[PDB]
């Protein structure tokens with residue numbers, strides 16, 4: 224097989240033949256803005272690249288076909304990237320997010336492997352046959368680190384270096400090569416970071432490096448060239464190609480650079496998701512972010528409970544766990560201005576309002592199955608009745624509470640009055656009630672009504688100025704709200720009894736709130752904070768996360784007890800009801816209708832007028 228050298232420069236990935244240096248061509252890719260890190264896969268001759276301007280990681284065949292973005296969310300500066308050709312994983316280092324991550328080569332099952340005490344990780348190199356990965360860190364005190372390829376047993380391998388790049392392993396000879404931008408040289412060590420030897424010096428900015436057979440190849444920005452030298456002696460130096468300024472990466476493309484074996488074998492180690500190499504020649508089964516590995520050490524389980532929080536253009540998920548796993552961005556396309564979110568735990572689908580396009584949309588957490596539920600309306604807030612399978616939502620333009628089935632079929636309006644201004648809304652189908660803020664002129668109110676709009680009552684009319692967020696927790700039997708003018712968070716029993724102020728200090732702009740276990744979580748848009756308060760009163764107010772821009776909503780997802788769920792009388796085929804099914808205070812469950820219809824004598828069906 225003829226070996227080739229690939230390199231990135233500007234928006235191009237170019238190929239040079241190491242047998243005939245004159246032959247230089249561009250790989251036929253479209254849509255590239257800035258080609259950065261490069262790699263390939265020996266199995267199928269796909270090329271992989273990062274684009275630090277577009278914030279993506281992509282792949283394609285060398286003929287340009289099957290071009291796809293395998294990572295396109297939650298990146299900032301993906302400067303390091305490598306293919307694990309044995310486990311069939313993609314690894315990357317993001318200098319902006321300070322994370323080292325992994326996924327399958329097609330982008331599935333993304334997981335964060337390193338995220339704590341990480342300062343500008345840059346050049347990544349993998350040794351899947353041995354089960355170790357290596358990377359450089361710039362930032363405060365530059366160093367080269369090593370970890371197992373599942374992220375475990377992280378150590379500093381080389382503590383005394385300048386800003387290092389082009390980290391490359393000679394797998395045949397068991398040596399690690401890198402460039403040093405500050406000491407102005409290329410050097411190598413053994414795999415333990417010992418027996419260091421300078422190969423070439425007087426290189427003001429050796430930015431890229433690779434190795435093939437007896438030669439190293441590098442590019443120095445001051446020389447504007449790609450050069451080659453003997454890897455051991457540093458002699459026999461020649462120019463491969465000149466007049467190449469600011470080359471970002473170089474890669475020897477040849478099958479001998481992706482050899483060896485490991486115990487993942489041809490079966491992904493029988494791991495359900497990720498097969499991650501660990502020393503020596505072995506593996507562990509890995510899981511997507513927030514999943515847990517089952518007792519069998521092979522299969523993964525999705526998180527049973529988590530918190531969602533939205534920004535203007537992102538929906539994020541976080542978990543509370545012993546590892547303190549990091550928050551992730553959900554890969555949901557076409558977000559523009561997310562105003563409010565909800566989640567259906569039965570079908571595992573995220574719902575949101577987008578205020579740019581005035582729509583209610585849904586998708587799976589992995590981004591698939593995107594669908595428009597409601598589309599001059601102006602949705603403000605939404606709340607899912609997970610038993611009856613419909614969404615209650617407020618319209619800021621017509622000032623109604625409308626009800627729409629999850630599949631988009633309208634049920635109809637349950638609240639409308641000439642002076643009514645329904646805004647925040649939350650349903651409690653366990654008891655048959657909905658709760659809403661009513662921002663009536665000169666008299667804001669918190670109200671409730673049965674889920675068909677009957678039995679309307681004002682719970683609170685005093686001590687309200689701009690109640691902007693509303694939440695409830697059926698287990699605690701409590702209602703919660705936040706006022707952005709009085710700058711406080713309050714609570715009461717769901718009946719309206721026992722109103723209390725939870726917090727009235729250091730609140731600026733409390734735009735959402737949610738209950739997770741015994742904690743009330745809220746988001747403050749101005750302070751850019753998620754914070755929590757302990758409802759048992761034992762622990763103090765605690766900061767959860769800071770510096771989150773454009774916060775819009777927060778939503779806790781409890782674990783769904785499927786047996787309890789199916790015991791809800793509206794859970795089986797909407798209790799036989801054509802429109803609304805609801806629990807009543809007298810202990811019965813009944814069918815009812817939106818405002819334009821009446822219940823017929825069968826007590827199941829609604830008819831006109």
Ligand SMILES: *[C@@H]1O[C@H](CO)[C@@H](O[C@@H]2O[C@H](CO)[C@@H](O)[C@H](O)[C@H]2NC(C)=O)[C@H](O)[C@H]1NC(C)=O
Pocket residue numbers: 266267268284285286287288
């Ligand atoms: C581009 O290159 C790829 C990889 O060499 C080609 O993919 C093959 O396509 C054929 C028929 O379409 C299949 O039988 C093979 O299974 C594919 N191979 C792999 C590794 O995926 C693709 O055909 C090429 N495209 C062009 C236009 O030449």
Ligand SMILES: *[C@@H]1O[C@H](CO)[C@@H](O[C@@H]2O[C@H](CO)[C@@H](O)[C@H](O)[C@H]2NC(C)=O)[C@H](O)[C@H]1NC(C)=O
Pocket residue numbers: 596597598618621623625626627631632633634635636
């Ligand atoms: C409540 O929302 C539904 C959408 O879920 C609205 O239904 C639309 O009504 C318009 C005319 O008013 C029709 O052109 C559309 O075809 C309807 N869409 C669907 C999916 O049925 C309904 O108008 C809303 N009701 C109120 C009172 O605002």
Ligand SMILES: *[C@@H]1O[C@H](CO)[C@@H](O)[C@H](O)[C@H]1NC(C)=O
Pocket residue numbers: 437453454455456459
């Ligand atoms: C590289 O240098 C080493 C040490 O001097 C020598 O043994 C080897 O033959 C050289 N290889 C090439 C390809 O020049």
Ligand SMILES: *[C@@H]1O[C@H](CO)[C@@H](O)[C@H](O)[C@H]1NC(C)=O
Pocket residue numbers: 518519520
């Ligand atoms: C799973 O691995 C753990 C150690 O991580 C070990 O104690 C246990 O025996 C393993 N269980 C199975 C079923 O392989």
Ligand SMILES: [Ca+2]
Pocket residue numbers: 260261304389472473
């Ligand atoms: Ca590289």
Ligand SMILES: [Ca+2]
Pocket residue numbers: 404405406407426427428
């Ligand atoms: Ca320098």
Ligand SMILES: [Ca+2]
Pocket residue numbers: 564565605606648649693694
């Ligand atoms: Ca809500």
Ligand SMILES: [Cl-]
Pocket residue numbers: 381382383384
């Ligand atoms: Cl050292």
Ligand SMILES: [Cl-]
Pocket residue numbers: 682683684685686
């Ligand atoms: Cl009151």
Ligand SMILES: [Cl-]
Pocket residue numbers: 649693694695696736737738
């Ligand atoms: Cl809530």
